[PDB]
Ligand binder design. Sequence first.
Ligand SMILES: CC(=O)O[C@H]1C(=O)[C@@]2(C)[C@H]([C@H](OC(=O)c3ccccc3)[C@]3(O)C[C@H](OC(=O)[C@H](O)[C@@H](NC(=O)c4ccccc4)c4ccccc4)C(C)=C1C3(C)C)[C@]1(OC(C)=O)CO[C@@H]1C[C@@H]2O
Ligand SMILES: CC(=O)O[C@H]1C(=O)[C@@]2(C)[C@H]([C@H](OC(=O)c3ccccc3)[C@]3(O)C[C@H](OC(=O)[C@H](O)[C@@H](NC(=O)c4ccccc4)c4ccccc4)C(C)=C1C3(C)C)[C@]1(OC(C)=O)CO[C@@H]1C[C@@H]2O
Ligand SMILES: Nc1nc2c(ncn2[C@@H]2O[C@H](COP(=O)(O)OP(=O)(O)OP(=O)(O)O)[C@@H](O)[C@H]2O)c(=O)[nH]1
Ligand SMILES: Nc1nc2c(ncn2[C@@H]2O[C@H](COP(=O)(O)OP(=O)(O)O)[C@@H](O)[C@H]2O)c(=O)[nH]1
Ligand SMILES: Nc1nc2c(ncn2[C@@H]2O[C@H](COP(=O)(O)OP(=O)(O)O)[C@@H](O)[C@H]2O)c(=O)[nH]1
Ligand SMILES: [Mg+2]
Lengths: 426, 426, 430
Amino acid sequence: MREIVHLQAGQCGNQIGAKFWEVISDEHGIDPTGAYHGDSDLQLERINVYYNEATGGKYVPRAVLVDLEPGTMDSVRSGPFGQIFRPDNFVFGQSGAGNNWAKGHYTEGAELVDSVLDVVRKEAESCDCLQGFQLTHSLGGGTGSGMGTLLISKIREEYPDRIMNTFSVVPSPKVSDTVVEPYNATLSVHQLVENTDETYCIDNEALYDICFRTLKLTTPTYGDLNHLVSATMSGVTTCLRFPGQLNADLRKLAVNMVPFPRLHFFMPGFAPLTSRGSQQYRALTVPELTQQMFDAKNMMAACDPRHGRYLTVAAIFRGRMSMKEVDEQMLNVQNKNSSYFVEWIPNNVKTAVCDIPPRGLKMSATFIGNSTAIQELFKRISEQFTAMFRRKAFLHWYTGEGMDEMEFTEAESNMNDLVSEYQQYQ
Amino acid sequence: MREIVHLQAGQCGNQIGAKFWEVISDEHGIDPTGAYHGDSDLQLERINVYYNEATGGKYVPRAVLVDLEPGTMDSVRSGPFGQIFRPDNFVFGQSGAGNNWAKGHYTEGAELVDSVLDVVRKEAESCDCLQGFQLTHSLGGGTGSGMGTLLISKIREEYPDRIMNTFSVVPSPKVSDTVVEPYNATLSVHQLVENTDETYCIDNEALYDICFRTLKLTTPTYGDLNHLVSATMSGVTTCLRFPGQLNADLRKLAVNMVPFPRLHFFMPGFAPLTSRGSQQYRALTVPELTQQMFDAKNMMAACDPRHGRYLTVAAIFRGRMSMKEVDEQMLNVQNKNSSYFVEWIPNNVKTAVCDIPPRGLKMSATFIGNSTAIQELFKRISEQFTAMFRRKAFLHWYTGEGMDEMEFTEAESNMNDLVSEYQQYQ
Amino acid sequence: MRECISVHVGQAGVQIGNSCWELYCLEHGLQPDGTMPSDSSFGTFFSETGSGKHVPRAVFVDLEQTVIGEIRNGPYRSLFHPEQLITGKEDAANNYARGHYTIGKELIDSVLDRVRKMADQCSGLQGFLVFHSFGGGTGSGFTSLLMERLSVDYGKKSKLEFSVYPAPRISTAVVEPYNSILTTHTTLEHSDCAFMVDNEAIYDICNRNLDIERPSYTNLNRLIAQIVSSITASLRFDGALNVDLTEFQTNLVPYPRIHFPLVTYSPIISAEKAYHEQLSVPEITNACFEYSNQMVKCDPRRGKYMACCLLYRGDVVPKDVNAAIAAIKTRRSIQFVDWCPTGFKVGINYQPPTAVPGGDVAKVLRAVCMLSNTTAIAEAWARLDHKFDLMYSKRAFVHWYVGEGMEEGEFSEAREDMAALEKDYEEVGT
Ligand SMILES: CC(=O)O[C@H]1C(=O)[C@@]2(C)[C@H]([C@H](OC(=O)c3ccccc3)[C@]3(O)C[C@H](OC(=O)[C@H](O)[C@@H](NC(=O)c4ccccc4)c4ccccc4)C(C)=C1C3(C)C)[C@]1(OC(C)=O)CO[C@@H]1C[C@@H]2O
Ligand SMILES: CC(=O)O[C@H]1C(=O)[C@@]2(C)[C@H]([C@H](OC(=O)c3ccccc3)[C@]3(O)C[C@H](OC(=O)[C@H](O)[C@@H](NC(=O)c4ccccc4)c4ccccc4)C(C)=C1C3(C)C)[C@]1(OC(C)=O)CO[C@@H]1C[C@@H]2O
Ligand SMILES: Nc1nc2c(ncn2[C@@H]2O[C@H](COP(=O)(O)OP(=O)(O)OP(=O)(O)O)[C@@H](O)[C@H]2O)c(=O)[nH]1
Ligand SMILES: Nc1nc2c(ncn2[C@@H]2O[C@H](COP(=O)(O)OP(=O)(O)O)[C@@H](O)[C@H]2O)c(=O)[nH]1
Ligand SMILES: Nc1nc2c(ncn2[C@@H]2O[C@H](COP(=O)(O)OP(=O)(O)O)[C@@H](O)[C@H]2O)c(=O)[nH]1
Ligand SMILES: [Mg+2]
């Protein structure tokens, strides 16, 4: 019944993934041992969406864990929930990607993908009706960017009609840890624009802006960033895991969210987010969830939506709430902000409403933006790429893996073609 | 239902604000955790006016907390009620205002206002019907005076028809802690006369005079001054939070209180106030509440009303009391004191009567004076400003922030224009 | 957040530093090995390493080894990072030009490298606290070399400067007037608030208030550090009216060049008398206006006050302070300028003054540091430029300065620039 297969690539993809599995195990009431310990029948009704039943009523999550180094598998397996995953589903190399896309895609991960893909088959053949693939990765570095997009290509060729749905942490100039980040991302975005049905563009600069300007955390870690990402991952699948007044499958999102085939680079958000010391003073209700959700400080990519227009927004609400009040606020937003929505679509907002809010809050909303403002994320990577590439800097590490200079020229060409298609509807 | 958005600026605004949130949480029966623990349905009926509902029936107050230093956020968050506020609503810088208006308005707070204003949007979009903005600040120093009036300007431009209602602690010569206090206030009053719909002028000299000559406190702290201010803040909104024989919204006050657009610099007071050792000897009743309320020692600005005439007074009574007795005393006052009211208005007193008196007293009255005697507060600041400014003293700290000498000349010009309009109706 | 880099220069600055860091360690409960037994109150003055060791945000600089080799050997040898105790081979010889042009020219780019490695560990650095002698060769010449660099490298950051300044009669050197006048460009152009202090004024405070008949420099430095603890207390602790390091300057400094406040502390008191005096807020406020407690030998009654910062600490209440400053406004002998009708900036902090256990200065519930911009300080400049004039009329020692790379015209250009500051403080009193 609409099973998902989930795949984790590199350090970032395994870290946002290993936090996601702690979040949806809390929702479904699954113990770190894999045993069920929840309150409610609704937690158990759709446990098959993310888990396999095994003997003694132990639940085993349908993750595949992929890396070119053992050290992230060792960090996940030893972690808060590490014992939950199937030992056979940890698929790994020994020598890493070197932060090189071409090691991921052509050498170190091209060896390993035959050992990954045949595990993706065992999980997809155990499904009753697979709806799709949910892949967590980063576009900087070499494992997530280059092996993860190799793996997207292989699963896309094998499962052409299932939803391919990716959560993609990607570079920005003011929060960076790699010299060759622009190269790896430009080579990787070239695969995402052709193969994925949805890609949720996420940024460490925007995830730090939520931690300082909303949550007021003094020292936000990667563990705090991974918690913001995984809340929106739990959010968008909610309507195939729980009952609701308006149900929306990942495909019911895609049909409404993607006007023209390639414009599927979304930008997620979440509400309510409150400063930890301030919760007692806030009224949780649909118009406050709306005034947070649609504000430029809440979105998890550096793009200010005031630099573009939305094509479509989806607001996937959770909790006991009025359909008049939801339909009123999703009208009031796009009429009072009409200069920020495209005027050749007569209603830009999809709504969905689940009856079951996250554990410990009365309501919640996961936001998905599609906006021409995502041109700014692809533009700044393309101009960092260009300034290195005009002087061929660092290319011997990629051409040493047998990659052509022509593949860089063709990747940055396809990047400007993606920038041009969003700028066309501005 | 007539929601208010409340905003705290600088040390003083966050201190009178963080006490106000302890007072109205006692009224509405809200625990320091944010949980409801009150006696009565009437406490819960209008809890939305100052709070948001959140999961588990926790209430989160609709405050935004603004400072250019972390240390007052740290002092509020650690305080008696600090855990009540939303962590995202604490919006702050790192380097302070230096007691400089131009740092507040042009540099340190001009950076931060983009991060404040987008939180004021999340709270105002969560409202069902916003009636107004309730801003606490001081006109001395640099954060409240210069950032708070920047923020008034930004919210006024965005919400032109909602009530802008400010509580403004301001300088006087005999109780002063800053050398440049006159400059900061003169630059700030220039923004208040144009943008606010009401400004409640409050003075530390008058708040110390209440503590020594009425309450007989031996050592009054800023915590005791903040308690007098916050009693009148709870007072003026009472009629949208509780039922009454005569209801008065903040707008029903403004229409009656402000004859000509700019004459909205009010002067608050409260009754009963009694020496702590003397309460058992006093009869709480409408004519004793009146003989305190209308006496020059009770008002919270240094202006003796015997140096002017009132335009309008509003007496917002609370408790079970006779409308004949209220209407009798508000007549007897302005006929027996007729030389102290303007004689081109045929009745100078607005009355309102709420059915619910403050917790622990049988009746109460909040007084709001509008009087031509407020010329003396603007005059003495204008003459302290003039005596420094004739020799350009301290101006390199303001002109260093790119401010003109022409802006000082234009601020003191607009100050004398406000003095002249009150002196015109004398 | 709220860091300060403290730079201790020459023998006077290093020995005041050895009292400052003696105090700050007691006040934050840090052992002399940098460890802390059992809030971020220490963060202004100490970086914390993962071992639980608190390392001071300080640089100690001397052109000769002797005084810093004593810091490297005494009880604080384990407190400081070993490469932020910085020494040369060669003494500056009480010659400004050795400090500035010839000897300090070699150590400066190493001094800056430590200050860079400290500033890169700050997050919203509040300012610099620079400690020195006006009369020294390293004190005048090396501080003036360093400040010129810090004023291009860190142009926005507030530079607070604590100076031991030449006295009316007490002096340790013949060339003390030359080094002090050559320093006046440093304080005018490359400083934001400069606290002049005098050895002879503290010697008289010690005699009259502590009743110590014959004090050393350890007794002086234990008063000079106590003032900087009180300036920084609002950066370090909770208070009723905390004062930011720029909030301080916005009330002290009326005009760009008028940033030379007096400083005083009350109560200076011994254990013989502290149990018989009341030490009420009224008395310790009034003590700051006595000529007897000013730490520069000039009379405030021969001036006018421009602004006062009364920085109270310990058990005080804003009631008491307002009631106190009301009596100061009533007294006709304490005269403010016509253009400062407010006069007083008040700070109030909840942390009492820490006693150094070996010290003369007694335990008390309250203290105030009063920092005060007044026209009177121009007399301490009029004393010293009259000492300069007698020697420069003969060129009395000038060959030692010209011999070490200084232009002879810099003496005229420094006496000229001092006369323009002594003009500015007379001009604003009117
Ligand atoms: C008493 C009270 O109000 O507790 C809240 C709380 O104070 C606040 C501040 C919580 C708290 O969130 C955080 O501290 C936080 C820190 C970094 C990054 C993200 C969150 C909370 O920890 C988070 C926690 O939320 C959940 O448990 C959700 O179900 C969430 N899952 C987890 O956070 C989780 C934690 C550990 C293990 C497994 C899951 C979730 C979100 C989306 C989809 C599914 C589940 C809640 C309600 C609270 C606390 C406990 C203080 C907030 O988060 C959520 C998701 O509600 C942060 O802003 C909201 C507003 C809440 O009021
Ligand atoms: C047995 C008795 O008579 O108790 C009284 C009392 O003795 C007196 C002196 C109280 C008392 O007030 C003070 O001590 C005080 C001190 C400094 C500044 C302001 C007040 C009282 O503390 C204050 C307290 O008032 C309240 O609780 C009000 O609801 C008030 N809220 C708070 O004071 C409060 C305190 C802690 C936490 C949260 C709120 C209020 C005022 C306006 C609008 C809403 C609420 C009351 C009746 C009393 C005591 C307890 C002695 C007085 O105050 C009030 C508001 O009634 C001071 O003059 C009045 C006359 C009262 O008789
Ligand atoms: N209070 C106090 N004054 C000191 C101390 N040490 C020196 N002085 C004063 O320092 C002044 C002279 O400066 P020097 O001590 O020679 O300064 P220096 O930087 O070491 O000079 P050079 O040796 O040339 O480098 C004199 O007026 C002394 O009174 C001290 O520990 N405390
Ligand atoms: N949110 C998040 N970002 C991470 C995490 N670890 C690394 N990143 C960041 O995103 C990039 C991820 O690249 P990485 O996963 O190291 O490359 P790979 O291992 O070769 O795929 C890094 O440069 C970091 O800036 C993590 O746990 N969470
Ligand atoms: N009532 C009251 N007044 C205060 C408080 N704190 C400071 N003040 C006074 O009013 C002025 C407020 O200025 P401040 O808030 O410090 O300036 P800012 O922080 O830059 O906005 C000070 O000079 C004090 O005299 C407080 O808690 N309550
Ligand atoms: Mg020396």
